[PDB]
PDB file of N, CA and C in Angstrom:
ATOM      1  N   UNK A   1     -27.376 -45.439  44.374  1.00 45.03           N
ATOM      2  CA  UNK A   1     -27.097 -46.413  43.303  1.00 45.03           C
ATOM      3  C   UNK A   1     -28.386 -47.064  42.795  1.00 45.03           C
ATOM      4  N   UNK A   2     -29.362 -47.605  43.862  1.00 43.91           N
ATOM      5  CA  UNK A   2     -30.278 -48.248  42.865  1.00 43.91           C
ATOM      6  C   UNK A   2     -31.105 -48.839  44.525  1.00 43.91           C
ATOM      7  N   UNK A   3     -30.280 -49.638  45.362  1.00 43.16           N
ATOM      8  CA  UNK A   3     -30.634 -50.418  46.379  1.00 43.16           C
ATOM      9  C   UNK A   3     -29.864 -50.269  47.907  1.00 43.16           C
ATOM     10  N   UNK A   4     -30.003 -51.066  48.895  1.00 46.49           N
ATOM     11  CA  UNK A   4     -28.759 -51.082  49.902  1.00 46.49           C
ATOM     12  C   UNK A   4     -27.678 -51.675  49.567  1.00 46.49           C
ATOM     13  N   UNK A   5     -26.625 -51.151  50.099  1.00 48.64           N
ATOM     14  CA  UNK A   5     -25.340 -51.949  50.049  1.00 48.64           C
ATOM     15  C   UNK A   5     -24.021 -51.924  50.977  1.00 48.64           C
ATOM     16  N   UNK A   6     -23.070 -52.862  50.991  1.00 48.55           N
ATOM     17  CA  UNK A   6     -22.137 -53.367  51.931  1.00 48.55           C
ATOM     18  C   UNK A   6     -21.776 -51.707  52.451  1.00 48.55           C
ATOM     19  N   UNK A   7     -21.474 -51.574  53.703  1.00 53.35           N
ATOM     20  CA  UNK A   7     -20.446 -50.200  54.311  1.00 53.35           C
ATOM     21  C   UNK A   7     -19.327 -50.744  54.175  1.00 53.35           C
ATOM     22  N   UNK A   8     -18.562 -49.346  54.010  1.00 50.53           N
ATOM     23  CA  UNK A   8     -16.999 -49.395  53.792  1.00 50.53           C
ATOM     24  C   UNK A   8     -16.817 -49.473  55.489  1.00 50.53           C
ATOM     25  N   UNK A   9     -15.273 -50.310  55.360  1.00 53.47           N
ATOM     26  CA  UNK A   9     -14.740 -50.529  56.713  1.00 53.47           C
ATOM     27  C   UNK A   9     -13.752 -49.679  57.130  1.00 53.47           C
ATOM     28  N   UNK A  10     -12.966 -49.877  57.780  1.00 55.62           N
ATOM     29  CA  UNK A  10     -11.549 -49.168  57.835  1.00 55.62           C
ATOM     30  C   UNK A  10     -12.057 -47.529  58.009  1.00 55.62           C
ATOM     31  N   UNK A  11     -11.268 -46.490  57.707  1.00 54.06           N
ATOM     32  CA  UNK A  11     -11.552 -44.946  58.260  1.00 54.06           C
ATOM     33  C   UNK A  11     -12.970 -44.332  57.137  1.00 54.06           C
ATOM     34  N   UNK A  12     -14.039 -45.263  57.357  1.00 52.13           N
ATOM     35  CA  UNK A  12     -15.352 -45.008  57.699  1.00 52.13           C
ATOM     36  C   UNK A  12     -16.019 -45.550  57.998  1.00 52.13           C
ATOM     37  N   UNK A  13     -16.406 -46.596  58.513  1.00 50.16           N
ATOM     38  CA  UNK A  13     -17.615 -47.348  59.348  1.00 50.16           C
ATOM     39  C   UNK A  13     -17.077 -46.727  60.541  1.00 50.16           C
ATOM     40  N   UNK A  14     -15.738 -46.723  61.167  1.00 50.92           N
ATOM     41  CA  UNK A  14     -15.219 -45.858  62.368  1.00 50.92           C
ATOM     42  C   UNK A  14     -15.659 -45.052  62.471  1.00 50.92           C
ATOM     43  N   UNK A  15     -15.106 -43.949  61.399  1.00 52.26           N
ATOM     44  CA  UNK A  15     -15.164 -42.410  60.882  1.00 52.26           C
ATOM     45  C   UNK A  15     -16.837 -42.082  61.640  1.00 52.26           C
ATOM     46  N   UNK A  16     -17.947 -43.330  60.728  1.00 55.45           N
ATOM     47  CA  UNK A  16     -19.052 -42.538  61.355  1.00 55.45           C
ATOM     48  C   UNK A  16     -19.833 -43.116  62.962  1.00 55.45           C
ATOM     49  N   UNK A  17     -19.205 -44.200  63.155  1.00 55.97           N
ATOM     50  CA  UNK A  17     -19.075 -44.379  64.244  1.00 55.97           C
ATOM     51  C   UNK A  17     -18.356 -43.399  65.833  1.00 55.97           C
ATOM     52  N   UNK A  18     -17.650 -42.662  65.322  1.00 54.68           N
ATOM     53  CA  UNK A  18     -16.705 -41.597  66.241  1.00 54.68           C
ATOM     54  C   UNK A  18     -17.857 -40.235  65.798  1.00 54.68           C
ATOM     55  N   UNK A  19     -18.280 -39.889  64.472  1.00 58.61           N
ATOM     56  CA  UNK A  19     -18.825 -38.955  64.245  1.00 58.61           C
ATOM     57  C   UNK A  19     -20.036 -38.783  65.281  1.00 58.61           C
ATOM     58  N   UNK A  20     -20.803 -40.043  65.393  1.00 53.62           N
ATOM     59  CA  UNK A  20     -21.869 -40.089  66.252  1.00 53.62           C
ATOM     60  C   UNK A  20     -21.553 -39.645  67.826  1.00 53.62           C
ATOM     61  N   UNK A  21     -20.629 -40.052  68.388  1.00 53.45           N
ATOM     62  CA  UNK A  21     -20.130 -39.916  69.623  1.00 53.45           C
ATOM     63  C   UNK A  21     -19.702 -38.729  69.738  1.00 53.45           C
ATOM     64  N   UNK A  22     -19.128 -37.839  69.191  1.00 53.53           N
ATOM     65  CA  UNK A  22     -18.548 -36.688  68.878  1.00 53.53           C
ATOM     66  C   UNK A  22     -19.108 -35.690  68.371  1.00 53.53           C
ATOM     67  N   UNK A  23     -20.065 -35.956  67.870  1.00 54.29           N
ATOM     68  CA  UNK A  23     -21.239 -34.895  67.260  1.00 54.29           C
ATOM     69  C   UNK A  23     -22.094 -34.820  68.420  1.00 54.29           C
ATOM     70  N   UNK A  24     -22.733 -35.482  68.732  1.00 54.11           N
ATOM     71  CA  UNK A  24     -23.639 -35.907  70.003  1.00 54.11           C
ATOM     72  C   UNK A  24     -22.834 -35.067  71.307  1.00 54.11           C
ATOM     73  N   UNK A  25     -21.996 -35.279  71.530  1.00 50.93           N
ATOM     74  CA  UNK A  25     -21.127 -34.964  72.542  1.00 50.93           C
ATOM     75  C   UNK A  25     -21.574 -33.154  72.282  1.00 50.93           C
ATOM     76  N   UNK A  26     -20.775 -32.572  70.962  1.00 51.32           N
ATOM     77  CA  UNK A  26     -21.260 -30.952  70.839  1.00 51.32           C
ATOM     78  C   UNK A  26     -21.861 -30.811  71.044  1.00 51.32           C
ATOM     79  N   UNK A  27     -22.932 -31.300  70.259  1.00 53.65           N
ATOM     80  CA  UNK A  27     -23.982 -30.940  70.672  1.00 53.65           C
ATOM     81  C   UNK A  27     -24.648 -30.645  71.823  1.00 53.65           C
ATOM     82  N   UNK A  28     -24.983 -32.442  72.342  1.00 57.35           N
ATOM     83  CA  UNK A  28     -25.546 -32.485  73.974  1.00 57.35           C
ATOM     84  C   UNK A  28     -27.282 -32.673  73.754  1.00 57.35           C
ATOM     85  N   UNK A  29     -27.524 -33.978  72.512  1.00 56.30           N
ATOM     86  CA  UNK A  29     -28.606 -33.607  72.442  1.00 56.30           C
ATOM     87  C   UNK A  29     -29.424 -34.522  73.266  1.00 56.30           C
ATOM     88  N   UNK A  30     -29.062 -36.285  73.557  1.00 55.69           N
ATOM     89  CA  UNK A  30     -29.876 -36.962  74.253  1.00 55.69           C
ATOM     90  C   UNK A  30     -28.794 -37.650  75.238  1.00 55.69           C
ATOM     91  N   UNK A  31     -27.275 -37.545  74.594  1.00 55.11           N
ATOM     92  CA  UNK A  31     -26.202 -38.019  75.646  1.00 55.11           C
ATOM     93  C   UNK A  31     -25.420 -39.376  75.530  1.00 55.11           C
ATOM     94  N   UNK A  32     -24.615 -39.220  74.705  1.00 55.27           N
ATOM     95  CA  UNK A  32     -24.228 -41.172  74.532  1.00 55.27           C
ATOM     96  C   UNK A  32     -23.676 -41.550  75.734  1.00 55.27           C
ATOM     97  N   UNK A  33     -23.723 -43.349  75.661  1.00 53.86           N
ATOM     98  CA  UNK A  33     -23.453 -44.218  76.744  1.00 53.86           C
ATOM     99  C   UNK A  33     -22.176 -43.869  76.994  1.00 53.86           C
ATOM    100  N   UNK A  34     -21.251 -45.096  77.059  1.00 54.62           N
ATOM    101  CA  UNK A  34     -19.724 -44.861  77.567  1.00 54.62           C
ATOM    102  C   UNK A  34     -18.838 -46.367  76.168  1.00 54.62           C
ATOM    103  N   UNK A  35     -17.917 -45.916  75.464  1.00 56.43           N
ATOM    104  CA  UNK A  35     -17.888 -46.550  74.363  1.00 56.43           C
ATOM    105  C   UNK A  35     -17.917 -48.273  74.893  1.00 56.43           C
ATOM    106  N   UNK A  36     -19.101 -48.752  73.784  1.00 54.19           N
ATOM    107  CA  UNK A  36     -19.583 -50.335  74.489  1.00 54.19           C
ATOM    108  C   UNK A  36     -19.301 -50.784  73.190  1.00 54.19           C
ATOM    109  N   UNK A  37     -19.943 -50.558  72.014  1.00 48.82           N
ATOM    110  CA  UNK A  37     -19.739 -51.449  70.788  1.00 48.82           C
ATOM    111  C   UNK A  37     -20.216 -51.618  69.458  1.00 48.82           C
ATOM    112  N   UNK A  38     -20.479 -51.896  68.312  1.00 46.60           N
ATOM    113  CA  UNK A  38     -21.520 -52.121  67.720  1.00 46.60           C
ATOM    114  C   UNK A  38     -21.716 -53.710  67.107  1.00 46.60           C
ATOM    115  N   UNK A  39     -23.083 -54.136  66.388  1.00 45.10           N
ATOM    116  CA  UNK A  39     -22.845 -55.718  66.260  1.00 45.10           C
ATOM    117  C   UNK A  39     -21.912 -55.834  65.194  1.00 45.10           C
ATOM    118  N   UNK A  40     -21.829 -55.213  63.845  1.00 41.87           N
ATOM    119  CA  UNK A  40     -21.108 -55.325  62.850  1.00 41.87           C
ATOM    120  C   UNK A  40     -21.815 -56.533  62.081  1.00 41.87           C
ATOM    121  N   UNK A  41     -21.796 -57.085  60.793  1.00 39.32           N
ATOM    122  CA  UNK A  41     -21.488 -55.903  59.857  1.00 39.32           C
ATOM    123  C   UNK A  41     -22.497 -54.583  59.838  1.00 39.32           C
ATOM    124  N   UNK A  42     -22.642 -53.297  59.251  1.00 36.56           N
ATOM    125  CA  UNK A  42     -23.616 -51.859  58.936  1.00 36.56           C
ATOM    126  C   UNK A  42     -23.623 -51.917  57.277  1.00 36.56           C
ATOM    127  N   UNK A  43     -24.547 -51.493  57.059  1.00 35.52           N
ATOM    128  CA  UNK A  43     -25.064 -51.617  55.370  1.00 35.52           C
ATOM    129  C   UNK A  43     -25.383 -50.333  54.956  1.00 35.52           C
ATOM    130  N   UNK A  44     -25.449 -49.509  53.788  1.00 33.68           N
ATOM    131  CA  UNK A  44     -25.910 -48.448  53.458  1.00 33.68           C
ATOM    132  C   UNK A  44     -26.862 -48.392  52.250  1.00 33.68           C
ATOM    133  N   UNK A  45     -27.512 -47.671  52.206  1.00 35.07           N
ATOM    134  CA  UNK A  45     -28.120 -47.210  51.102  1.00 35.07           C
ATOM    135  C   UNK A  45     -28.319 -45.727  50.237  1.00 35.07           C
ATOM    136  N   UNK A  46     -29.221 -45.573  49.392  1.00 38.86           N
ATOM    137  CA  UNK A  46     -29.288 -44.295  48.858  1.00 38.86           C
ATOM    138  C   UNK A  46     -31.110 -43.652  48.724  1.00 38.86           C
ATOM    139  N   UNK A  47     -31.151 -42.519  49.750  1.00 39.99           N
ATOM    140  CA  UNK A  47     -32.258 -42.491  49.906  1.00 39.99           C
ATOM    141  C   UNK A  47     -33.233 -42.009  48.798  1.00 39.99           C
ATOM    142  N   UNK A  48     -34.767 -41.858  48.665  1.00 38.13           N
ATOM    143  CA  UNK A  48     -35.085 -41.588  47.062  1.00 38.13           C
ATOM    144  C   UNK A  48     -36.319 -40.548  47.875  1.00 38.13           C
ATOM    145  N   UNK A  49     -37.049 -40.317  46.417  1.00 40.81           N
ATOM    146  CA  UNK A  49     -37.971 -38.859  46.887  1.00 40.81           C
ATOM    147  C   UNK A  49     -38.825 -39.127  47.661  1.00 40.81           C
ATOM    148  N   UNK A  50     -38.666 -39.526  48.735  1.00 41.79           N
ATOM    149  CA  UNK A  50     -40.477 -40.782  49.420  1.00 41.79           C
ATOM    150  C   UNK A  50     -41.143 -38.949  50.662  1.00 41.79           C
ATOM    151  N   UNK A  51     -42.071 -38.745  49.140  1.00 42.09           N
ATOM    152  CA  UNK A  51     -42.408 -37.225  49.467  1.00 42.09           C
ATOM    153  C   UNK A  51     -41.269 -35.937  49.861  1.00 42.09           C
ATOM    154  N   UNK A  52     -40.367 -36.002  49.022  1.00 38.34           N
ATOM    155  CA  UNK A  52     -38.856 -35.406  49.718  1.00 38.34           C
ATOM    156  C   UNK A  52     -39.118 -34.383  48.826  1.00 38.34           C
ATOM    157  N   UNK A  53     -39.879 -34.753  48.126  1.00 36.51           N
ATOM    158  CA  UNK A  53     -39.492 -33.386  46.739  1.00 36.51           C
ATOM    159  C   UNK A  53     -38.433 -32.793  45.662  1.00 36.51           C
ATOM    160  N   UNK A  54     -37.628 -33.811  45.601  1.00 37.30           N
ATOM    161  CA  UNK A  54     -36.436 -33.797  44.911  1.00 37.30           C
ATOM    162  C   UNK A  54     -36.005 -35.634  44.648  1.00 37.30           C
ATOM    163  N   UNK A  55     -35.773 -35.326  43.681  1.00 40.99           N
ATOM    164  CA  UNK A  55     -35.005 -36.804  43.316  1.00 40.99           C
ATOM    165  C   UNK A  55     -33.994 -36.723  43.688  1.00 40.99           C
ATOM    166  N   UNK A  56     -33.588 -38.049  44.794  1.00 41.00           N
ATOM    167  CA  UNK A  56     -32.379 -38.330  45.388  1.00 41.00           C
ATOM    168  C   UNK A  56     -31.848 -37.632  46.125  1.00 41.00           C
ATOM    169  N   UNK A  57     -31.798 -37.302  47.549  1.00 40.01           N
ATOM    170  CA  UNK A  57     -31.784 -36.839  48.585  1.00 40.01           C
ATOM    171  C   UNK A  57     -29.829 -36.933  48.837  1.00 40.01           C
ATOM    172  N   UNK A  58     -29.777 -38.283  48.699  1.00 40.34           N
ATOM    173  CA  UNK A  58     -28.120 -38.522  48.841  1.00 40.34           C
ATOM    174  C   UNK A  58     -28.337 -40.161  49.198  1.00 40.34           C
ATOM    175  N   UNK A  59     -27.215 -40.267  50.041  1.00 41.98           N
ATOM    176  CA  UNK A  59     -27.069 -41.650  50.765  1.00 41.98           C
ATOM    177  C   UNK A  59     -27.293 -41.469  51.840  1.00 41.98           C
ATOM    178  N   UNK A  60     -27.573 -42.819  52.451  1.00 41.22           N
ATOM    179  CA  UNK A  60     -27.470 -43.129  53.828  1.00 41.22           C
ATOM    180  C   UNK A  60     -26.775 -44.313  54.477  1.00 41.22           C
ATOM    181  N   UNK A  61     -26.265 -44.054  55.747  1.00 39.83           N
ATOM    182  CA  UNK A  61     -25.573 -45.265  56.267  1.00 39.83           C
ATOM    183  C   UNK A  61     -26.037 -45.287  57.526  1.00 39.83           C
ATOM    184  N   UNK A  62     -26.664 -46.723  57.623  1.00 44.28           N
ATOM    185  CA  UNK A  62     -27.638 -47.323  58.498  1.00 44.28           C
ATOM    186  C   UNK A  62     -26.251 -48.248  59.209  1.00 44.28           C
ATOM    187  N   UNK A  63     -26.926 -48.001  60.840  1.00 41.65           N
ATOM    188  CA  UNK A  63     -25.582 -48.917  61.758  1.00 41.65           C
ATOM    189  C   UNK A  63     -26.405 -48.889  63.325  1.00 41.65           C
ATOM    190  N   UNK A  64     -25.928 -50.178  63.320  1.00 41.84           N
ATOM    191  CA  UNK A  64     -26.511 -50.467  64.502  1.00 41.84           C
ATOM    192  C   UNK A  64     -25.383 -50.542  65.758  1.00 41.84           C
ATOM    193  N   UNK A  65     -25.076 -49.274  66.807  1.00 41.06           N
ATOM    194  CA  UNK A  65     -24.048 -49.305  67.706  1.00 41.06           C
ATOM    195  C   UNK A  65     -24.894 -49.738  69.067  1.00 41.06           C
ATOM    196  N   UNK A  66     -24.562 -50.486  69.650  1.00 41.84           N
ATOM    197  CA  UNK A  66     -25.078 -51.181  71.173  1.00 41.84           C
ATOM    198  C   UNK A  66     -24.370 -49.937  71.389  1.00 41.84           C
ATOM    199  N   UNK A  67     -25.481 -49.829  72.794  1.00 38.29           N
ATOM    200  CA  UNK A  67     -25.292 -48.418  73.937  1.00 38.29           C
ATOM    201  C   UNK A  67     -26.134 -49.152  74.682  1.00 38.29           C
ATOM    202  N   UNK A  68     -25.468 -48.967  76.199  1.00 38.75           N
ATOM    203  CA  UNK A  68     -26.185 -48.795  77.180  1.00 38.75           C
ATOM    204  C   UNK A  68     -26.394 -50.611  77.670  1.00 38.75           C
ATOM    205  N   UNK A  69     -27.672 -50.842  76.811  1.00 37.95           N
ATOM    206  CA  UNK A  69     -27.360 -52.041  76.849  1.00 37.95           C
ATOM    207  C   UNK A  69     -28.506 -52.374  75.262  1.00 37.95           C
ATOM    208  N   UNK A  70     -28.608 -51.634  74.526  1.00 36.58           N
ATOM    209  CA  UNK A  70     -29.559 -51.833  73.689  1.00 36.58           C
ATOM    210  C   UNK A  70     -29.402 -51.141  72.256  1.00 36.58           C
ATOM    211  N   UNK A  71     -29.255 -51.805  71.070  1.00 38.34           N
ATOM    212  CA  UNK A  71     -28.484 -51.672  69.887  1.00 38.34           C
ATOM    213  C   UNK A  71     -29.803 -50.390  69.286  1.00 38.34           C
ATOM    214  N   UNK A  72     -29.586 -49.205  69.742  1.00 38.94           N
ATOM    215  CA  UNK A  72     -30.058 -48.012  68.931  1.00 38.94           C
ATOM    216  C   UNK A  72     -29.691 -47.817  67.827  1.00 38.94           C
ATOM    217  N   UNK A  73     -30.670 -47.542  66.821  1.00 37.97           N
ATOM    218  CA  UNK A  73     -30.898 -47.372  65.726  1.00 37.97           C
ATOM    219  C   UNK A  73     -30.070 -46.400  65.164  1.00 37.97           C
ATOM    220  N   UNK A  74     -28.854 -46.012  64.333  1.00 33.96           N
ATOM    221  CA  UNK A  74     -28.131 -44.909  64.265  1.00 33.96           C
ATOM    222  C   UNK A  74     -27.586 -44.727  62.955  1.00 33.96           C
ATOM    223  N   UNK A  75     -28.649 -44.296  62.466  1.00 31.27           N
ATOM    224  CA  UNK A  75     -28.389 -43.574  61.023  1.00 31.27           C
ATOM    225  C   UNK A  75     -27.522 -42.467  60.217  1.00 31.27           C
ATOM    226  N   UNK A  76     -26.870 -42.251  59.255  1.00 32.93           N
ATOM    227  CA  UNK A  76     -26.157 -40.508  58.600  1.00 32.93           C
ATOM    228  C   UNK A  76     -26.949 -40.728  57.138  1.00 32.93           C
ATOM    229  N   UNK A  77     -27.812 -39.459  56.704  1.00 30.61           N
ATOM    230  CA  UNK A  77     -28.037 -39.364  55.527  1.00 30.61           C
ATOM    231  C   UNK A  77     -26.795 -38.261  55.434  1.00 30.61           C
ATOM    232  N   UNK A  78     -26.356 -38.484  53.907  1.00 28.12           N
ATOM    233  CA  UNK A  78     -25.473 -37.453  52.776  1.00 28.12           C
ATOM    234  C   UNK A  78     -26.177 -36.937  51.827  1.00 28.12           C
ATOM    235  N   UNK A  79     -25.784 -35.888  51.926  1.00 27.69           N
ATOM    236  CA  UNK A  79     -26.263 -34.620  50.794  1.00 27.69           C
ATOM    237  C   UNK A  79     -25.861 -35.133  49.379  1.00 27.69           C
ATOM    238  N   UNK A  80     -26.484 -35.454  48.313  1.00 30.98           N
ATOM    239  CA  UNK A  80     -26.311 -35.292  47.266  1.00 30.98           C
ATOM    240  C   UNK A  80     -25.389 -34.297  46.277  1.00 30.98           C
ATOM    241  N   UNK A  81     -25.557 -33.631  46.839  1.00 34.49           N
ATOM    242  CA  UNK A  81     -24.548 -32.019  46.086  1.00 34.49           C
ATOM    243  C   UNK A  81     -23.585 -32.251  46.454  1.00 34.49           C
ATOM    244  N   UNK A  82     -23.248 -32.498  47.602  1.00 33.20           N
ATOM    245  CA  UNK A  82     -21.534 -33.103  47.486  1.00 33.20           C
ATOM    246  C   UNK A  82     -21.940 -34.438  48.196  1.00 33.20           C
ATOM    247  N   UNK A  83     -21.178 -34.120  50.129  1.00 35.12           N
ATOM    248  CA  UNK A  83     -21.247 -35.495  50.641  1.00 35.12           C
ATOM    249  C   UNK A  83     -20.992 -35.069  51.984  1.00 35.12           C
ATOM    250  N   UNK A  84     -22.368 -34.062  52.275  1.00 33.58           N
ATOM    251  CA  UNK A  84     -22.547 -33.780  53.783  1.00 33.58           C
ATOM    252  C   UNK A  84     -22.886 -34.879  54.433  1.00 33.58           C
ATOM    253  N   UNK A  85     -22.872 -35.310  55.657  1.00 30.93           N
ATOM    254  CA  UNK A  85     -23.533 -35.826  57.056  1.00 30.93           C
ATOM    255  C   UNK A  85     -24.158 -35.376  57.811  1.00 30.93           C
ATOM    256  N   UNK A  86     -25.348 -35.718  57.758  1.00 32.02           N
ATOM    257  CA  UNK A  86     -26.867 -35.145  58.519  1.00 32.02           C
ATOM    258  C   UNK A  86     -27.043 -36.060  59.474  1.00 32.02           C
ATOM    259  N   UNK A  87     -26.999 -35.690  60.902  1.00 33.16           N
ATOM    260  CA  UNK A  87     -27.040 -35.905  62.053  1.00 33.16           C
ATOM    261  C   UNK A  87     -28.183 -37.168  61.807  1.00 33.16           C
ATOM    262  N   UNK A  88     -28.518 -38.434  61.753  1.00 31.58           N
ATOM    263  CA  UNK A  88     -29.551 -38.927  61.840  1.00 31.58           C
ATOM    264  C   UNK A  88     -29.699 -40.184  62.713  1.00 31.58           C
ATOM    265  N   UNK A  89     -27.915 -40.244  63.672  1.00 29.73           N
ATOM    266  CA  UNK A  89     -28.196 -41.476  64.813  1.00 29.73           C
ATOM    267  C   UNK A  89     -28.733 -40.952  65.583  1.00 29.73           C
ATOM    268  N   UNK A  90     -28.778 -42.186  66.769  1.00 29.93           N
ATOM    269  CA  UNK A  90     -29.634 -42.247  67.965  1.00 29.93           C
ATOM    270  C   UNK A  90     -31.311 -41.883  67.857  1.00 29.93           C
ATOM    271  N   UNK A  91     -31.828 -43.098  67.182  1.00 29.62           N
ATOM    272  CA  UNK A  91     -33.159 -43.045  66.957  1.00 29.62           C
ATOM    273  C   UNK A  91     -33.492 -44.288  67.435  1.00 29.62           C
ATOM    274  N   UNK A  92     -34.955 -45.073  67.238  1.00 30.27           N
ATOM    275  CA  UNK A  92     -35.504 -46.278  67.404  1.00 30.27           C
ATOM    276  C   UNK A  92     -36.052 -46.013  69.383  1.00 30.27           C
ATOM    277  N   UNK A  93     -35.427 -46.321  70.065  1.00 31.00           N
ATOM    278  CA  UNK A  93     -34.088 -47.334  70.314  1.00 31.00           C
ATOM    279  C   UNK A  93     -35.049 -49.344  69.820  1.00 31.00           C
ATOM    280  N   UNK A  94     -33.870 -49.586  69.214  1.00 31.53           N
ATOM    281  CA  UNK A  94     -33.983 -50.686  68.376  1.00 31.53           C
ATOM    282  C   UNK A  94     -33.674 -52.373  69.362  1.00 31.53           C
ATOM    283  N   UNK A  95     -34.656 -53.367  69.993  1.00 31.95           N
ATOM    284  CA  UNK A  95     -34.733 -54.161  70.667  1.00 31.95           C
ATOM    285  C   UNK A  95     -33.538 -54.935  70.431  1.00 31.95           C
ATOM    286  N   UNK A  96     -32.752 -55.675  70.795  1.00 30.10           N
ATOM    287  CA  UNK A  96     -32.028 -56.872  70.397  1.00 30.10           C
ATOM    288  C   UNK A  96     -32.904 -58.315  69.605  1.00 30.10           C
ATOM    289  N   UNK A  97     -32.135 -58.631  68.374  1.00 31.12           N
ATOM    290  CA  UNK A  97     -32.719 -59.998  67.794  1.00 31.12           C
ATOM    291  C   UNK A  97     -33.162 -60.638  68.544  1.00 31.12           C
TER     292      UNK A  97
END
């Protein structure tokens, strides 16, 4: 759209909340905790060419889920061409405020 903005609630802030746990899980790539929580509210944005080589990459939805005991950084960029989900949680890991 232009900037960040509010995440939808209800069957998607879940949606990608379960996606993370469940993708991760197939996978088996670093191993999630045991379901603990997240702080709420998650915000999204729309990512832009920052050296990408294409204008407008898609969106992204930025969310912060506590694991373990420490609110990791857990991102999904979307494909532009339609409205894929690109694996992009469990990063940082992100300190508590």
């Amino acid at each position: 759209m232009g900037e960040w903005e509010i995440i939808d609630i209800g069957p998607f802030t879940q949606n990608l909340a379960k996606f993370a746990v469940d993708e991760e899980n197939k996978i088996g790539q670093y191993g999630r905790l045991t379901f603990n929580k997240v702080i709420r509210p998650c915000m999204k944005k729309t990512i832009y060419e920052n050296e990408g080589f294409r204008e407008i990459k898609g969106y992204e939805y930025q969310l912060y889920v506590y694991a373990s005991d420490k609110l990791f950084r857990a991102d999904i960029s979307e494909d532009y061409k339609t409205r894929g989900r690109k694996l992009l949680r469990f990063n940082g890991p992100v300190p508590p405020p």
